[PDB]
Amino acid sequence: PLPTKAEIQECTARTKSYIQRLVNAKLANSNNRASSRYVTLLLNNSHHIEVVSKQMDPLLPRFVGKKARKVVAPTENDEVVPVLHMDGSNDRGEADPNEW
Amino acid sequence: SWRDKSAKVQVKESELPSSIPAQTGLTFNIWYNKWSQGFAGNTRFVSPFALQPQLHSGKTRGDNDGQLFFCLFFAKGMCCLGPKCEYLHHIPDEEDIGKLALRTEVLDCFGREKFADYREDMGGIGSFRKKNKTLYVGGIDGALNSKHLKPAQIESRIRFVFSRLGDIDRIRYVESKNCGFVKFKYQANAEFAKEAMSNQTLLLPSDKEWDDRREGTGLLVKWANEDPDPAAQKRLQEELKLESLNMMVHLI
Amino acid sequence: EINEPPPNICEQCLGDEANIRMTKIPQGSECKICTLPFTLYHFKTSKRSNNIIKTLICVRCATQRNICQCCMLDSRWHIPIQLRDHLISLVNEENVMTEEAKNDMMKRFLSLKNVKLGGAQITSDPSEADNIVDKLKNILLKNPSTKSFFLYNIDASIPEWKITDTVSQLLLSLIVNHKAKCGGLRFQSSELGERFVSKIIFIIPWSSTAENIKLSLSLNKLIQLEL
Amino acid sequence: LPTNHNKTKLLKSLKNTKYFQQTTIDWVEAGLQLCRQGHNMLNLLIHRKGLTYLHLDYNFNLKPTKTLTTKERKKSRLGNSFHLMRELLKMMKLIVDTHVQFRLGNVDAFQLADGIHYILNHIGQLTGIYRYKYKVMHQIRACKDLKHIIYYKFNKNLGKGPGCGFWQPAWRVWLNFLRGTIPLLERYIGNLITRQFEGRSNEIVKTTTKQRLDAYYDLELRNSVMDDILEMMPESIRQKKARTILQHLSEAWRCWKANIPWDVPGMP
RNA sequence: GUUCGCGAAGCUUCGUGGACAUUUGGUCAAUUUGAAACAAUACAGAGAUGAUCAGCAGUUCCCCUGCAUAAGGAUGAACCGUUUUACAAAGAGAUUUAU
RNA sequence: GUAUGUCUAAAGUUAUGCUCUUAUUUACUAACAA
Ligand SMILES: O=P(O)(O)O[C@H]1[C@H](OP(=O)(O)O)[C@@H](OP(=O)(O)O)[C@H](OP(=O)(O)O)[C@@H](OP(=O)(O)O)[C@H]1OP(=O)(O)O
Ligand SMILES: [K+]
Ligand SMILES: [K+]
Ligand SMILES: [Mg+2]
Ligand SMILES: [Mg+2]
Ligand SMILES: [Zn+2]
Ligand SMILES: [Zn+2]
Ligand SMILES: [Zn+2]
- How many angstroms separate the CA of residue B8 from the nearest CA in chain D? 35
Q: Which nucleotides of F are covered by protein (CB under 7 A)?
A: 2-5, 9-16
* Numbers of helices and strands, H then E, in chain D: 11, 2
- Experimental technique of record: cryo-EM
Least Cα distance to D40 among D104, D77, D85, D97 occurs for: D85
- The Cα D196–Cα D198 span in angstroms is 6
Domain extent, residue C127, equals 3-141
- H or E segment at B231? helix B230-251
Residues in chain B: 252
Closest residue CA from atom 4 of ligand 1: D144
Q: What phi, psi does D80 have (nearest 5°)?
A: -75, 0
- Angle ∠(C126,C131,C135) on CA atoms, nearest 5: 145
Amino acid residing at C61: C
Evaluate whether C68 touches C41 at the Cβ level (below 8 Å). no
Element (DSSP H or E) covering residue A4: none
Angle at C54 (CA atoms; ends C53, C56), nearest 5 degrees? 125
The backbone torsions φ and ψ at residue D248, rounded to the nearest 5 degrees and listed phi first, read -55, -50
| Torsion sign (Cα): C165, C167, C172, C177 | negative
Q: Using DSSP, state whether D143 is helix, strand or coil.
A: helix
Shortest distance between the Cα of C220 and any Cα of chain A, in A, equals: 55
Angle between helix axes C81-90 and C126-140 (nearest 10 degrees) is 60
The sign of the dihedral angle between the CA atoms of B139, B144, B145, B147 is negative
CA of D75 to C1' of F2 (A): 17
Closest protein residue to E26 using CA and C1' atoms? C52
The answer to whether the CB of C132 falls within 8 A of the CB of C180 is no
Under the phi-then-psi rule, with left for phi > 0, alpha for psi from -120 to 50, and beta for the rest, what region is D235?
Answer: alpha
H/E stretch holding B117? none
Residues 6+ away with beta carbon under 8 Å from C154 = C176, C178, C181, C183, C201
Query: How would you class B168 by CB atoms within 10 Å of its CB: exposed for 0-12, middle for 13-18, buried for 19 or more?
Result: buried
Using the 8-state DSSP alphabet, how is residue B135 labeled? E
**Chain A environment of D233 (Cβ under 8 Å):** 100
Give D232→chain A minimum CA distance, Å: 9
Pairing relationship of beta strands B35-36 and B134-138 according to DSSP bridges: unpaired
Host H or E run for residue B70 = none
Length of chain D (residues)? 268
Give the other-Cβ count within 10 Å of B45's Cβ.
14
Residue D55 sits at φ, ψ, to 5 deg, of: -85, 120
Distance B194 CA to F16 C1' (A): 31
Which domain CATH number covers B203? Answer: 3.30.70.330
Query: How much distance in Å is there from the Cα of D206 to the middle of ligand 3?
Result: 12
Inter-chain touch C105–A72, beta carbons under 8 Å: yes
d(CA D167, CA B244): 83
- For residues C88 and C123, give the distance between their C-alpha atoms in angstroms, rounded to a whole number: 9
DSSP characters for A22-62?
HHHHHHHHSS-GGGGGG---B-SSSS-EEEE-----SSS-S
Instruction: Name the residue among D36, D77, D85, D34 with its Cα closest to residue D53.
Output: D77
Angle at B28 between CA B22 and CA B34, to 5 degrees: 65
Q: How far apart are CA D233 and CA D241, in angstroms?
A: 11
Q: Considering every ligand atom shown, identify the ligand nearest to the alpha carbon of residue D212 and give its number.
A: 2
> For residues B219 and A38, what is the distance between their CA atoms, to the nearest angstrom?
59
Give the CA count within 13 Å in the CB-facing half-sphere of B73: 18
Cβ–Cβ < 8 Å for B132, B228: no
How many CB pairs (< 8 A) connect B and C? 89
C73 touches chain B (CB under 8 A): yes
Helices C81-90 and B230-251, packing angle to 10 deg: 90
Answer whether A47 sits within 8 Å of C14, measured CB to CB: yes
Asked if D45 and D98 touch (Cβ cutoff 8 Å), the reply is no
CA distance C32 to C65: 13
Residue B4 burial (CB count, 10 A) = 7
Hey, which residues does C24 pair with through a beta bridge?
C41
The verdict on a CB contact (< 8 Å) between C108 and A47 is no
Ramachandran quadrant class, D166 (left: phi over 0; alpha: psi -120 to 50; beta: rest) = left
A-C contacts (CB, under 8 Å): 80
The length of chain C is: 227
**Amino acid found at C133:** V
The pairing of beta strand C52-54 with beta strand B179-184:
unpaired
Instruction: State the CB neighbour count (10 A cutoff) for residue B186.
Output: 23
The answer to whether the CB of B154 falls within 8 A of the CB of B140 is: yes
Q: Does ligand 1 lie within 6 Å of residue D152's CB atom?
A: no
Q: What does the angle CA B61 – CA B65 – CA B67 come to, to the nearest 5 degrees?
A: 90
Residues in a beta bridge with C37: C30
Looking at the DSSP assignment, which residues form a beta bridge with residue C173? C186
Residue B151 contacts strand F, CB under 7 A = no
Q: Using a 6 Å cutoff on CB, does residue D162 contact ligand 1?
A: yes
Residue D158, beta-bridge partner list: none
Distance (Å, whole) CA C96 – CA C128: 15
CA atoms within 13 A on the CB side of D187: 7
- Whose Cα sits closest to atom 26 in ligand 1? D162
Mutate to test the interface with A, among D11, D19, D245 (most CBs of A within 10 A): D19
Are B97 and B117 within 8 A, CB to CB?
A: no
- B233 nearest nucleotide via C1' and CA: F15
Q: Is the CB of D144 under 6 A from ligand 1?
A: yes
Protein CA D80 to sugar C1' E70 (Å): 13
- DSSP string for chain C: ----SPP---HHHH-S-S-EEEEEEEEEEE-SSS--EEEEEEEESSSS-S-EEE--S-HHHHHHHTB-SSS-BBTTT--BHHHHHHHHHHSS-S--------SHHHHHHHHHS----HHHHHHHSHHHHHHHHHHHHHHH------SB--BB---TT--HHHHHHHHHHT--B----TTT--B--B-S-HHHHHHHHHH---B------HHHHHHHHHHHHHHHHH-
Nearest to C43 by CA among C7, C75, C3: C7
Say whether B179 sits in a helix, a strand or coil: strand
Residue bearing the CA closest to ligand 1, atom 18 = D160
The letter for the amino acid at C72 is M
- Give the integer Cα–Cα distance in Å for B119 and B133: 16
**B contacts of D66 (beta carbons < 8 Å):** 26, 37
CA contacts within 13 A on the Cβ side of A44: 27
Q: Which residues of B touch D68 (CB under 8 A)?
A: none
Cα Rg of chain B (Å, integer): 19
Residues 6 or more apart whose CB falls under 8 angstroms from that of C1 comprise A25
Among candidates C218, C225, C211, C215, which has minimal Cα distance to C177? C225
Cα(first)–Cα(last) distance of chain A, in Å? 44
Chain centroid, CA C6 distance in Å: 29
Q: What Cα–Cα distance (Å) separates residue B236 from each residue in B212, C161, D133? A: 41, 16, 69
Taking an 8 Å cut-off on Cβ atoms, the answer to whether A69 and C36 are in contact is yes
* Residue B37, CB, strand F, below 7 Å: no
Contact B180, B221 (CB under 8 A): no
Q: Is the distance from CB of C8 to CB of C86 less than 8 angstroms?
A: no
Cβ atoms of residues C11 and A46 within 8 Å = no
Which of the 8 DSSP states describes residue B103?
Answer: G
Does residue D43 sit at the B interface (CB-CB below 8 Å)? yes
Cβ neighbours of residue D221 closer than 8 Å, sequence gap 6 or more: none
Angle at D163 (CA atoms; ends D157, D168), nearest 5 degrees: 95
Quote the minimal CA–CA distance from B35 to chain D in Å.
9
Counting every residue written for chain A, the total comes to 100
Interface test with D, best of A57, A89, A90, A91 (most D CBs within 10 A): A57
- CA–CA dist D236, D230 (Å, integer): 7
Helix (H) or strand (E) holding D179: helix D168-197
Cα–Cα distance measured from residue D37 to residue D89, given in angstroms and rounded to the nearest whole number: 10
Cβ proximity of B118 and B127 under 8 Å: yes
How far, in Å, CA of C153 to CA of C216, rounded?
A: 9
The whole-angstrom separation of Cα D131 and Cα D88 is: 12
Question: Residue C214, Cα to own-chain centre: how many angstroms?
Answer: 35
Structural domain boundaries, residue B185: 134-223
Give the residue, by CA position, lying nearest to ligand 1 atom 10: D148
| Dist. CA C20–CA C38, nearest whole Å | 21
In degrees and rounded to multiples of 5, residue C27 shows phi and psi of 50, 45
> Going by C-beta distance under 8 Å and a sequence separation of 6 or more, which residues neighbour residue D230?
D237, D242
